[PDB]
Amino acid sequence: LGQHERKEMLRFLTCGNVDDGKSTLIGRLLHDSKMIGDDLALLVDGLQAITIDVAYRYFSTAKRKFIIADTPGHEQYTRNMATGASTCDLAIILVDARYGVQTQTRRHSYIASLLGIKHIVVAINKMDLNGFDERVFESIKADYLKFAEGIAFKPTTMAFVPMSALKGDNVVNKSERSPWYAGQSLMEILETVEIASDRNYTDLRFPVQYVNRPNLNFRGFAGTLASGIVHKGDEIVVLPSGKSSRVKSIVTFEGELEQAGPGQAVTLTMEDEIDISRGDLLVHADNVPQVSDAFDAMLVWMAEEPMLPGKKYDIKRATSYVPGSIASITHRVDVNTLEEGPASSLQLNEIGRVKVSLDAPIALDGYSSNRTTGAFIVIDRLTNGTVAAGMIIA
Amino acid sequence: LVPRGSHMVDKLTHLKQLEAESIHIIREVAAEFDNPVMLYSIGKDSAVMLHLARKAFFPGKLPFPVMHVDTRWKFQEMYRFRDQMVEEMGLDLITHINSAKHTDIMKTEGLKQALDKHGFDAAFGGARRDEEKSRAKERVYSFRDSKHRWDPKNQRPELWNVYNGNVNKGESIRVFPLSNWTELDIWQYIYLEGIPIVPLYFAA
Ligand SMILES: Nc1ncnc2c1ncn2[C@@H]1O[C@H](COP(=O)(O)OP(=O)(O)OP(O)(O)=S)[C@@H](O)[C@H]1O
Ligand SMILES: Nc1nc2c(ncn2[C@@H]2O[C@H](COP(=O)(O)OP(=O)(O)O)[C@@H](O)[C@H]2O)c(=O)[nH]1
Ligand SMILES: [Mg+2]
Numbered sequence: 084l085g086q087h088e089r090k091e092m093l094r095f096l097t098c099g100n101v102d103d104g105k106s107t108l109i110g111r112l113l114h115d116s117k118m119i120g121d122d123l124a125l126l127v128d129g130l131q132a133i134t135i136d137v138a139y140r141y142f143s144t145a146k147r148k149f150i151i152a153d154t155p156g157h158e159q160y161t162r163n164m165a166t167g168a169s170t171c172d173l174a175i176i177l178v179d180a181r182y183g184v185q186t187q188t189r190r191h192s193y194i195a196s197l198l199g200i201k202h203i204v205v206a207i208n209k210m211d212l213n214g215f216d217e218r219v220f221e222s223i224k225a226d227y228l229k230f231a232e233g234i235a236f237k238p239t240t241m242a243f244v245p246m247s248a249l250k251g252d253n254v255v256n257k258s259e260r261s262p263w264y265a266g267q268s269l270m271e272i273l274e275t276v277e278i279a280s281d282r283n284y285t286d287l288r289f290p291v292q293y294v295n296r297p298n299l300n301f302r303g304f305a306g307t308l309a310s311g312i313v314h315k316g317d318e319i320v321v322l323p324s325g326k327s328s329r330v331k332s333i334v335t336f337e338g339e340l341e342q343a344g345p346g347q348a349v350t351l352t353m354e355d356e357i358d359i360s361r362g363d364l365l366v367h368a369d370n371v372p373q374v375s376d377a378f379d380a381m382l383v384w385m386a387e388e389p390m391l392p393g394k395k396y397d398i399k400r401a402t403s404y405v406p407g408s409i410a411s412i413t414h415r416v417d418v419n420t421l422e423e424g425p426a427s428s429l430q431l432n433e434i435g436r437v438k439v440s441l442d443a444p445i446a447l448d449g450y451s452s453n454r455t456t457g458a459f460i461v462i463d464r465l466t467n468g469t470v471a472a473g474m475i476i477a
Numbered sequence: 478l479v480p481r482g483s484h485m486v487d488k489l490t491h492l493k494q495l496e497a498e499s500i501h502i503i504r505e506v507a508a509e510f511d512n513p514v515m516l517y518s519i520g521k522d523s524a525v526m527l528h529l530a531r532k533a534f535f536p537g538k539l540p541f542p543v544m545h546v547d548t549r550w551k552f553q554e555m556y557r558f559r560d561q562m563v564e565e566m567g568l569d570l571i572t573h574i575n576s577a578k579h580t581d582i583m584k585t586e587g588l589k590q591a592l593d594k595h596g597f598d599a600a601f602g603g604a605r606r607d608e609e610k611s612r613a614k615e616r617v618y619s620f621r622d623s624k625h626r627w628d629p630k631n632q633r634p635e636l637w638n639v640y641n642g643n644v645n646k647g648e649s650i651r652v653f654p655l656s657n658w659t660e661l662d663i664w665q666y667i668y669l670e671g672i673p674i675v676p677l678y679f680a681a
């Protein structure tokens with residue numbers, strides 16, 4: 084009460100294989116966040132007790148709100164981890180202290196990095212078993228960093244925590260079992276990591292979602308700010324066509340705002356009767372992204388049915404909906420080994436660089452520049468299913 | 478020219494972020510579906526959802542009607558609250574009427590029958606993922622077929638805040654705007670927004 088009114092929201096992903104200790108870890112987190120008595124036991128039990136499913140877990144502190152995205156670590160559930168990773172701010176890459184970096188460690192890291200997770204914490208678990216051997220910790224940290232170096236995997240924060248999910252060491256409170264550890268505990272990271280990772284305060288992207296026309300004289304353009312800051316009187320342009328207008332008003336239920344930032348559900352009114360439909364992007368006139376009908380992209384294929392170049396699909400970017408096809412597959416990335424390989428097909432759970440072609444041009448951004456306007460889904464025209472997750476390279 | 482910084486706008490708190498995310502979902506459905514309905518209980522979660530729906534369309538009214546699946550009888554203070562709510566907001570409320578047996582015939586079948594009579598293809602439910610254990614693997618969009626059943630392969634992965642609403646003729650969905658909210662989030666939202674609530678303070 085009182086302090087719980089102004090908190091942030093952090094979504095984080097949990098990555099690891101059978102018996103790494105993630106049911107124990109999650110159970111420990113969900114439990115010790117409530118202790119401001121082994122009930123923990125029943126929590127861990129419940130969590131231990133072919134699907135597209137992602138498990139979403141909820142808990143909070145006084146500092147912030149947490150959503151845990153839980154997904155199994157087996158290759159077969161890559162699409163599942165991809166789905167979960169898409170909204171996450173941070174990933175907990177969980178390793179067993181005796182085994183160190185494995186193929187699943189490499190695979191989960193790639194998926195997290197691919198889906199734009201800017202914060203990873205390597206949770207080196209079961210350190211209680213090796214007697215909190217610093218040598219083991221340093222060994223695992225170094226060869227994970229060596230792996231990270233060979234991906235250009237440069238997230239904004241990378242932390243290595245020696246812990247015991249079972250015993251609680253460095254999970255919530257710092258451990259006396261590791262005097263050689265100067266870093267912060269998990270939870271201390273989870274509460275303090277800056278989530279100004281939505282870097283896009285610099286470039287306005289407003290995907291037009293809904294044309295609100297209540298009466299004949301109010302014409303509003305509703306949606307969510309993907310990036311940048313819009314200000315009353317800003318000179319904007321739509322990116323379908325290139326034509327310009329000035330922002331008359333920023334309209335919300337609370338009233339009229341002078342400015343609005345990323346992640347805000349607003350409605351924009353315009354000074355000129357400019358023609359704006361759902362699917363168009365509204366942008367700053369002095370800062371305009373490329374507009375094209377062809378682009379490179381990473382694809383996470385997630386349908387049982389294979390992907391065939393030339394076959395018509397529907398591309399839903401954000402609010403931009405345009406039919407098209409993949410012209411060619413540049414390569415398919417083997418998720419286990421992280422190397423390029425030629426292909427003429429993409430199977431279930433497969434990832435590759437593709438050449439995309441659309442029937443009409445959209446405004447575009449590299450997914451690494453913009454998490455919204457660089458992200459898209461591939462939709463089958465006959466089955467209506469969401470068959471692939473796409474992220475633009477530019 | 479130097480770009481604008483975050484120090485200019487008030488940073489998104491958890492409730493504001495949840496608010497925006499739920500507004501976005503409501504707008505998408507409205508944007509893609511012909512005949513949506515907001516399934517409105519007379520309870521606390523549906524009150525938050527209805528408040529979100531208003532925020533989603535200001536200064537317009539709801540482009541969709543609101544529905545209440547009426548049983549034999551609920552608390553007397555609920556009927557009186559909801560009746561006044563319709564008159565005080567110029568709302569379009571549809572009532573429908575035709576705990577093991579009771580709930581099955583009146584709610585489950587009633588709601589099923591209500592959707593068919595009007596021809597709705599999308600339905601807003603205020604259910605939350607933290608309310609029951611199973612809800613953890615639930616998605617925002619829940620795809621139902623013509624005869625109304627749920628099929629696993631017809632369900633679609635929900636990637637960012639991009640949602641796939643492509644549906645066939647006679648097929649309908651269930652939308653859960655509040656799925657990311659917790660019990661604490663809702664009350665905290667009710668308190669800060671001053672959302673009117675039924676005098677009884679125990680989950681209806
Ligand atoms: N009889 C009904 N008529 C219309 N919508 C309903 C009905 N029952 C449930 N719903 C919808 O389905 C969701 C599930 O209901 P509940 O879990 O009981 O939440 P609530 O009734 O809004 O709040 P409570 O009961 O005070 S915790 C609600 O958000 C309603 O929008
Ligand atoms: N000694 C030790 N045991 C652990 C640790 N974490 C988990 N375990 C044990 O490993 C077993 C499997 O853990 P679990 O959380 O179910 O792994 P999961 O399959 O990833 O969910 C259980 O008996 C746990 O008690 C740890 O840090 N140290
Ligand atoms: Mg109720």
Ligand code: NA
Binds near residue numbers: 604608
């Ligand atoms: Na409820």
